[PDB]
Amino acid sequence: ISPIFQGGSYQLNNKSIDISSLLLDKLSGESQTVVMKFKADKPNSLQALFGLSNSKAGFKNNYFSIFMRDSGEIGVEIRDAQKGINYLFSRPASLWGKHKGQAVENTLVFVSDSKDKTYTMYVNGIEVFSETVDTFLPISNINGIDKATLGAVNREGKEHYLAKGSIDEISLFNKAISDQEVSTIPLSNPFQLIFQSGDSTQANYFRIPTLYTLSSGRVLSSIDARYGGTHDSKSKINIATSYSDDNGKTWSEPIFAMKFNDYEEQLVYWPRDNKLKNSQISGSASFIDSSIVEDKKSGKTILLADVMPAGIGNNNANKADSGFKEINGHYYLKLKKNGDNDFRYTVRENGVVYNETTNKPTNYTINDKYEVLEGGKSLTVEQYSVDFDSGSLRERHNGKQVPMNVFYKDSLFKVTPTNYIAMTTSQNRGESWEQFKLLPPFLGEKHNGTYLCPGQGLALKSSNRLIFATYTSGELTYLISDDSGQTWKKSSASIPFKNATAEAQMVELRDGVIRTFFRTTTGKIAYMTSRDSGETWSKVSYIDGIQQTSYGTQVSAIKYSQLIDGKEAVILSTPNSRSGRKGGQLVVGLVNKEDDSIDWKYHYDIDLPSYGYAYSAITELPNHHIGVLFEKYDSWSRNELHLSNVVQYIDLEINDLT
Numbered sequence: 001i002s003p004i005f006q007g008g009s010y011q012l013n014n015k016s017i018d019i020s021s022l023l024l025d026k027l028s029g030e031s032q033t034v035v036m037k038f039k040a041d042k043p044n045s046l047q048a049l050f051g052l053s054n055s056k057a058g059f060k061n062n063y064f065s066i067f068m069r070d071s072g073e074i075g076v077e078i079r080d081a082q083k084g085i086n087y088l089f090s091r092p093a094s095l096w097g098k099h100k101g102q103a104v105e106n107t108l109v110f111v112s113d114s115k116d117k118t119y120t121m122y123v124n125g126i127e128v129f130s131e132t133v134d135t136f137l138p139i140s141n142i143n144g145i146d147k148a149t150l151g152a153v154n155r156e157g158k159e160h161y162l163a164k165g166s167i168d169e170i171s172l173f174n175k176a177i178s179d180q181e182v183s184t185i186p187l188s189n190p191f192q193l194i195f196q197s198g199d200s201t202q203a204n205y206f207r208i209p210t211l212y213t214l215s216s217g218r219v220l221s222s223i224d225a226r227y228g229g230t231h232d233s234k235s236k237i238n239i240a241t242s243y244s245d246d247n248g249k250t251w252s253e254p255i256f257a258m259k260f261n262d263y264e265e266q267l268v269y270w271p272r273d274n275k276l277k278n279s280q281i282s283g284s285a286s287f288i289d290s291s292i293v294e295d296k297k298s299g300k301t302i303l304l305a306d307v308m309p310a311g312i313g314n315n316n317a318n319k320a321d322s323g324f325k326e327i328n329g330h331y332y333l334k335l336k337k338n339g340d341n342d343f344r345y346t347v348r349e350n351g352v353v354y355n356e357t358t359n360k361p362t363n364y365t366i367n368d369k370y371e372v373l374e375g376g377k378s379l380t381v382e383q384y385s386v387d388f389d390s391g392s393l394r395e396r397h398n399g400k401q402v403p404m405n406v407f408y409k410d411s412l413f414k415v416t417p418t419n420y421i422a423m424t425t426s427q428n429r430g431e432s433w434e435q436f437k438l439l440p441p442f443l444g445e446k447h448n449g450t451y452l453c454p455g456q457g458l459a460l461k462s463s464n465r466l467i468f469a470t471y472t473s474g475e476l477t478y479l480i481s482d483d484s485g486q487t488w489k490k491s492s493a494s495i496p497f498k499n500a501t502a503e504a505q506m507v508e509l510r511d512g513v514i515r516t517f518f519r520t521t522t523g524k525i526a527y528m529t530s531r532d533s534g535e536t537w538s539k540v541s542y543i544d545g546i547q548q549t550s551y552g553t554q555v556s557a558i559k560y561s562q563l564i565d566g567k568e569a570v571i572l573s574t575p576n577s578r579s580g581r582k583g584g585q586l587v588v589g590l591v592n593k594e595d596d597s598i599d600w601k602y603h604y605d606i607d608l609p610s611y612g613y614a615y616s617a618i619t620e621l622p623n624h625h626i627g628v629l630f631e632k633y634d635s636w637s638r639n640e641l642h643l644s645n646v647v648q649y650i651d652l653e654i655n656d657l658t
């Protein structure tokens, strides 16, 4: 259908533009669509892009607005004091501000559908909210509307919520356009999606991105596919992967690298209201925080992640138990059988379940998928599904049988309720993944596993050495393999912190010389150095010129292949803010060959200082461009939980950064 009104190139310079005579008499019927292409790289704190109001004295609360905040939040108000209606719908972190220093043209589509009684907002091709109401308020049925306004709302004759920005194009339709029609509207997106709601993972949420460039030229990404909102474990979370063979222009449909099936893969809209938002899937096993490296020698791609048994997360994990029993120099996985108070079993060689009290093998075995067999026959459990149909979160059996896994709630034999690290490998560069295997304890029988640092492992350039950083209380614990990941040893580097989330990423400054950058509790990013390929580590120092919050945020880092200003270069990706997870930057450091110190010379702004930026992944793409996959929202904020499609990918060139 043709638009009833269309205008363009409006500059919003803290002065409203009146379009009443062009639009108001054209509005008819109870359904409308607004399509608006707009820029705002220096927004006010709160500003209206579009308003329909009763501007008469005594009717200040009779209006419709489309508004934004300098946080990147988008929203609408629909109000009529006579009808007693005051709707306010919004979602944080919905907008772009700048990309490569130029203002981004955001494409906004707002559908007011009277038949459905639903208000739906899309920005940049992403649905950010869809709200169904009991009593529908058509945007043009507001009592006494007499002004149509761009860049403010006219209330009682005055300009409220003045906007700074521009509207390149605005169209209105006297119809609620269908989802199919919305999808045909052209976009000018500065970003891509690799993982997204509705894809093959069927997760509605995603966190903790990784990127790694393989020697073939293929670029690989992994991620937490989070089902029960954006919550850390305890929850349902799988590790998913996708790859690109064209320098990041397109990406394969995701597959899983690690997955559990005790709960259904459900695409669920997790509630965002204050009463329900902390609802958390509490009976599911999960994976969380993945990291990838490529092994030159074997050709294998190796991926590690934390594993959490049913109902377990960092919070309630059995500290003081590895989950393993050491028996004459070997670690065996412990099991507790239904009805016992203690863990009287171990998993011996060939998956044989052994009774530690009677010292006899049982007629139970654990296969390579950690599934329980009895007399060689596969046992099963019934799968759970989740719903909020009763007004609160419900977890219940759904009629479907799946293999009984020792990480599951319903399993006859259960592992120790603590955190583990698992490893999987791919021999076809991410096209498929082998069944995962648990790594052994590294810090003793009665110490819970260390926590994997998400992002990349490190493959040393002049040897076969592989290193994955992990952390625990009081130290970074580096896991080192010289045999393609078949065996691992630890290298402990104490840090002056108790219980910090010390997420660490490494760069090889030169042969044998490793610099590790890591998150702390001090508001500054820290670093340490190894000059012997990770055997021993320096004391801790801190980077100046970058701010983090007290709780900190994961940081990613690479050694760039090409010289910059004649020097070896490291690139760092992090929020640069003392206030929240926002103000995303790539910081380019030039290495001083004399002393290995780094001159942090260039700071590239990913988007606005006030716009969200949390966990991130960076890689040098085969064409020497930089790929960034990152959480474009404040993933700490309790106001920004459970947003869909905020993990986004962008392509940059080195000249963009300098």
Ligand SMILES: O=S(=O)(O)CCNCC1CCCCC1
Residues within 6 Å of the ligand: 232, 288, 289, 306, 313, 314, 451, 501, 635, 636
């Ligand atoms: O809250 S954030 O800093 O965004 C994420 C922190 N996750 C913590 C970590 C999760 C997996 C293993 C236990 C600890």
